[PDB]
């Protein structure tokens, strides 16, 4: 029953009542406990079109996290065009928790189970669903953490490379295990990855690239300018804002006790607003070992509009794209 529309969606999670940290405290009143039996209805002999970038469902998630982030991590100072603000800024406990969005009455959501689906046009095998699988909301530039992984092969998703400026996005078949650390110079930080995982991924990436763009010599190079967040890999890990050098990881042509590549990060009291234009000031750090093991699930890049070569450079900026990588194969329809 192909009939797309606009609605006001609602959240779902496994929030905890005793708890004091942010995410779940937002969840306890903004939504509902998970139903331990999510069912699926396969639709035999039906194929249907979709355009995987023009979606209100993304915007609602986008607006939710804004209305989440603004009220909970309350900064010390805020500023943009003729306007300055300062409130109380306590350090808070924090983590990412998996979320499902769900469908109101006279209406349901579907699943494009084409694991070889790119974005454009028809989904072959399809089913219907009450609510999506769990996703913890990852606020990150360049890289995609803790999200949804590929099952068959590593596939690429962008509007069209003919319109280059359309940010290109990636999701992977296997996960890269990363650990970041700041010990108890209290500003300078660092991050760690063991070479062999990173080297082969980009090899298998380059191999799927020489196909998508017919003919080439795949070269990887870093960012070229503009503000901090996008030029770096910027992210949150419990009560701060990480900003890490990404210069080494984009390293030219990749060709067909375990050694670790180590990246010089730093933290910032000062952050450029990701919702709109604006620059932000937060509480200084707390003492001790600051660590998170989290896994990379994909990546954002942009086709470099320069040279008869194959220069691919890190993306980011927008967070609507950050939402795109996991909700990809979950849709909007009327029962009629």
């Amino acid at each position, epitope marked *: 029953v192909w009939k797309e529309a606009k609605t006001t969606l609602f959240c779902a999670s496994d929030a905890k009542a005793y708890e004091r940290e942010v995410h779940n405290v937002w969840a306890t009143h903004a939504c509902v406990p998970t139903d331990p039996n999510p069912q699926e209805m396969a639709l035999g002999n039906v194929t249907e079109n979709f355009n995987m970038w023009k979606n209100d469902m993304v915007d609602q998630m986008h607006e939710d996290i804004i209305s989440l982030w603004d009220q909970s991590l309350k900064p010390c100072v805020k500023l943009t065009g003729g306007s300055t603000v300062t409130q109380a800024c306590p350090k808070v406990s924090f983590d990412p928790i998996p979320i499902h969005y769900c469908a109101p009455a006279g209406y349901a959501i579907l699943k494009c189970n084409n694991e070889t689906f790119e974005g454009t046009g028809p989904c072959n095998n399809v089913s219907t669903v009450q609510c999506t699988h769990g996703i913890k909301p990852v606020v990150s530039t360049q890289l995609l953490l803790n999200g949804s992984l590929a099952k068959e092969e590593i596939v690429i998703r962008s509007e069209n490379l003919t319109d280059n400026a359309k940010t290109i996005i990636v999701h992977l078949k296997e996960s890269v295990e990363i650990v970041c650390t700041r010990p108890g110079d209290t500003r300078q930080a660092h991050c760690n990855i063991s070479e062999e995982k990173w080297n082969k991924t980009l090899q298998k990436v380059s191999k799927i690239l020489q196909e998508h763009f017919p003919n080439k010599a795949i070269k990887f190079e870093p960012h070229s300018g503009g503000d901090l967040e996008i030029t770096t890999h910027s992210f949150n890990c419990r009560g701060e804002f990480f900003y890490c050098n990404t210069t080494k990881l984009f390293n030219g042509t990749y060709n067909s006790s375990n050694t670790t590549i180590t990246l010089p990060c730093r933290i910032k009291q000062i952050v450029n607003m990701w919702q709109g234009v604006g620059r932000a000031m937060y509480a200084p750090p707390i003492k001790g070992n600051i660590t998170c093991k989290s896994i990379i699930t994909g990546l954002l890049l942009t086709r470099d509009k320069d040279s008869n*070569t194959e220069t691919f450079r890190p993306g980011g900026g927008d967070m609507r794209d950050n939402w795109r990588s996991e909700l990809y194969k979950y849709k909007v329809v009327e029962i009629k």
Partner: antibody
Amino acid sequence: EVQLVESGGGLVQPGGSLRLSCAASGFTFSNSGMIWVRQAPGKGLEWVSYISLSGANTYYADSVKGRFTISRDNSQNTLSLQMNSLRVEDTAMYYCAKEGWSYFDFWGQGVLVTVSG
Amino acid sequence: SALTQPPSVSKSLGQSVTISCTGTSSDIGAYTGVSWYQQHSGTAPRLLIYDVSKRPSGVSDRFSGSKSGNTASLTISGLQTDDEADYYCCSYRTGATYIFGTGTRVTVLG
């Protein structure tokens, strides 16, 4: 109507210097890569140099490497080729050409550079 | 180091002619950034085929391009008097470089 106007051809003594200019109109000069191409009298064509739209990425051939220099001005919409330490084997008809992508539509009329004493 | 063409081929008016273009596993075998070009004696070259088989606007359909393993090929059907010229193929090589073919002189008989 797209054009490529070449100038600066003529005789140079061997070891001497010359600079070639290619003037462009009818399209956006930036957003497009550019190439120099020479043709020795009665011989096959050979690629000289590549420059990218913003610059920064410049590529050269070996029988020319270290002697020729590619530059562009994205305001005046001009391509420049500075040539030093010229030998007689370089005597050729020289062409500037616009890049589509990995292919090359639209060509200059050709300026002949002769290297002789 | 160079792309091998037959130096000369010869057919009649209306007939079809095939030019072969041979390189290495580092240029033609890997890539489809392949482009064919026409050169009458003493004029500027004109773009014919690009990306193996594609035609730009301004080029007669009688021309067609192809690729297999390590060899590119050009096909000109319905031969005319205008078609009498030198022909060259072009390829991207590993290391952002480009390389040109030896040249095929097409002679239209009768």
